Amino acid sequence: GVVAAAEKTKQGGVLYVGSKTKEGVVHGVATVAEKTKEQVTNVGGAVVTGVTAVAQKTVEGAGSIAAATGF
Amino acid sequence: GVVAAAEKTKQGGVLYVGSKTKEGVVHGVATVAEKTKEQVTNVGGAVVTGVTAVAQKTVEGAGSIAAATGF
After folding, report:
1. Distance in angstroms between the alpha carbons of the first and the last residue of chain B
2. Closest by CA position to A56, among listed A26, A10, A15, A8
3. Where on the phi/psi map is residue A6: left (φ > 0), alpha (ψ -120 to 50), or beta?
4. CA B67 to CA B62: how far, in whole Å?
5. How far apart are CA B33 and CA A32, in angstroms?
6. Which has the closest alpha carbon to A43: A25, A17, A64, A21?
7. Is B27 annotated as a binding residue?
């Protein structure tokens, strides 16, 4: 069936961000529906979201997503 | 100067409105500014405002508006 497996076996830079916004509306991962059966959202990584969203070295590993929606 | 005068000396229909809206956003008389000196709004009549705004025989009289904005 639906199987997810992730293995991480580890045997063994200036970033300046400046923002100045008077008004800001930010939407990240958004799923919108009126009539649906399944609305599954799977997050294995990063969904860093904001007016000044900064992501630095977020997803650096074994990630597995298995979805069997429907049937 | 600024003078307003109104005199009303009175010496002596089926209206069916049906509305069906799932979502409604209604704005009537709206004045929007970021930097202004005067923002005067004068109402002598009717500003009937709504999702199902109905006006029937509203302004039937002597109405006077005198505005001396500025100078």
Report:
1. 12
2. A15
3. beta
4. 17
5. 34
6. A64
7. yes
> What residues of A form the annotated binding site for Cu cation?
27
Cα–Cα distance, A41 to A58 (Å, whole number) = 19
Q: How far apart are CA B28 and CA B48, in angstroms?
A: 8
Residue matched to tokens 């992730």: A6
Q: What is the resolution of this structure in A?
A: 2.7
CA distance B42 to B35: 20
Q: Two tokens at A34?
A: 């009126």
Q: Method used for this model?
A: cryo-EM
Which two tokens mark A29? 């991962």
User: Could you tell me the maximum CA-CA distance found in chain A, to the nearest angstrom?
Assistant: 51
Token pair of A47 as six digits: 């969904």
The per-residue b/e assignment along A42-70, b for 16 or more CB within 10 angstroms, e otherwise, is eeeeeeeeeeeeeeeeeeeeeeeeeeeee
